[PDB]
Amino acid sequence: PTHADSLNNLANIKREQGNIEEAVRLYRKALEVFPEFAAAHSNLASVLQQQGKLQEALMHYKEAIRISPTFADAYSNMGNTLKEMQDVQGALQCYTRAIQINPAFADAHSNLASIHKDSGNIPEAIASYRTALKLKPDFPDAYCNLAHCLQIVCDWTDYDERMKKLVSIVADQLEKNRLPSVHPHHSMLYPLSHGFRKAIAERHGNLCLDKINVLHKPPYEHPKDLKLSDGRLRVGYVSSDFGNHPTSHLMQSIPGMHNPDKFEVFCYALSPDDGTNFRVKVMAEANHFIDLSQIPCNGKAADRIHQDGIHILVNMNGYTKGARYELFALRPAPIQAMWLGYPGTSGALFMDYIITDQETSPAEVAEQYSEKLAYMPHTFFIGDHANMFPHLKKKAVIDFKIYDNRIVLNGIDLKAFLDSLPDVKIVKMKCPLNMPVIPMNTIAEAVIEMINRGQIQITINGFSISNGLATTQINNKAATGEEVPRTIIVTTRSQYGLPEDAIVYCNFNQLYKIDPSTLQMWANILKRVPNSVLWLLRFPAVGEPNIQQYAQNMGLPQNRIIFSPVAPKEEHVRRGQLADVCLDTPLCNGHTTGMDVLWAGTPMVTMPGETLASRVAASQLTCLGCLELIAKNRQEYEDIAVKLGTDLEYLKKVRGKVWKQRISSPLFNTKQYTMELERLYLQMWEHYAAGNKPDHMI
Ligand SMILES: CC(=O)N[C@@H]1[C@@H](O)[C@H](O)[C@@H](CO)S[C@@H]1OP(=O)(O)OP(=O)(O)OC[C@H]1O[C@@H](n2ccc(=O)[nH]c2=O)[C@H](O)[C@@H]1O
Prior knowledge:
With about 700 residues, the protein is of the alpha/beta class. The protein is about 45% helix and about 10% strand. The protein has 29 helices and 19 strands. The strands form three sheets. Strands 3-2-1-4-5-6-7 form a seven-stranded parallel β-sheet, with helices on one face. The radius of gyration is 27 Å and the shape is globular. It starts with a helix and ends in a 9-residue tail after the last helix. The site of the ligand CC(=O)N[C@@H]1[C@@H](O)[C@H](O)[C@@H](CO)S[C@@H]1OP(=O)(O)OP(=O)(O)OC[C@H]1O[C@@H](n2ccc(=O)[nH]c2=O)[C@H](O)[C@@H]1O has 22 residues, from helix 12, helix 24 and helix 25. One of its GO terms (cellular component) is nucleoplasm. Its main location: nucleus. One of its GO terms (biological process) is protein O-linked glycosylation.
């Protein structure tokens, strides 16, 4: 039992050090010496859980509890194991049982909070995180996870203090080689240094290198020419997001546009098949598609990649839901690049390049990243909008009393419907081509009637005319962006309770991207522009009273902020046509959301910051060729925004420019983007065929 205790204690330190294999052997020696050692079973279980041996872990947790039925820590850790196996009901039964045994057990309250948050119950997660912090006031994980909950709902109580405390917690954990409590993915939201953001990511890279050392992989041997591959670069795209995920909504066309004379495309899915057209398309069009979700061991999965012969392995996840950086730590290919999925540095030495651009990541901030900058010539950002929403390439309007954004029609067959109608007026557009106007006739009245009654659709002259609010009832695959709508769709400001006679500023991001500064700039803009409203989403809904209160306190009258629900994907893109201007979030820009609003022809005002995440919208707008929409400070952001809301001719000009340039510019041109990505990939390959080290590409 004390032979046993020293084996157990050594093992605990071996684990803390990251010598996971060593820790396992010692816990087993501990149980060899002393079978009924509840703590040794529970500790062996925790390290088996870390290794992904979830059924073996569960078995040792239950042993721990059989030996000691009041071992609340075993139940708490078992609960985390069941949560990783997706058994949320089992996870709750264990957490709640741990809190029933010891109501003062802070870790259990924190684990429970975390499952409330994941379930979309932010108010209970907040309550449980605060219980945890009441029981254990020095609890970085609970404090930082709580700061993230409060961010999500725009709770800004003691914001400046909270911000200082996050920084000092991270400093303190960085000192003492502890895994920081701020997740790499959240680190852009807080006033940390670039070293702190890089340092946070560096340490999640480190923890992958520890997990794979149990496997004992010899360094893989990497092809040094294209002889085995018939003169083709073998490019492997690794993603958890091949399915209905933003990433697929950006890049699903890229695999099948690769030049097969020079490239051979491998898609490695880390997720199982969700049944969506997004997965179907990438499986159909990639030269090779591999479901690594069927190959859970990372050793055998990185093997599966080395025997494909990959030259460039592309990491589209970053520290996200379902990433397997273990695959990239084992370096199964000679060039490993960060692309598109994660808006930050991996902080890992085992990633060579980050595919970015000069506006997103200027050279002066190259040490903000662990990777070498690999510049795309325009933006690194891409969108599949031209393929997913071609019905938004053109629009028509109904003249209710001429506005481009009160009552809007969009459809593949819109030209044929318009031509069925008597007296349609064409307005030549103020672009650097034309907008059909339907006058207020019997036809026009029938459409507005269908909107007012909440009616799903009508028929005019044989054409299907759909209510834009009812797309999931007419064609659920059109609502998700999986199919192109086959009816003419009607979109109106009345459907969203927006004013027919005022400027609509929009921002369709999750609310966490808003901070006190940003909402103060927005309130400033609304006060300068009487009439005007700010159009936000219930993302989530429990964020709305906070926003509305802090805006009431900034002297902004009631009824100047209008909230809409989160919509299906194509409604969200289509309904951006109803806004005048999009006010981008400077803390963390719209990324996918920025592409969505530009596709609708809606100008976006942005203020690029330090972080990659704060500069993506300014990169999109530079590629689009709209430099007048990029602000160098907050006064300029407000002045640009107020000008677009008052100078109506300037508004018409700027909108006309976005409308034309979404087609003319490279921003939405997936073929051009794939060709530039191919040039940049052959540069990466040359530089290493000639046996040089990764370096900056400009
Ligand atoms: C910080 C951050 O996560 N940045 C990421 C990028 O850097 C990555 O490159 C992107 C993919 O790899 S994801 C991401 O881009 P973001 O702008 O942050 O969007 P986010 O991740 O919150 O998703 C909102 C979605 O809801 C859809 N959306 C939105 C509103 C609505 O009503 N309906 C709807 O379908 C939108 O169309 C979106 O598809």
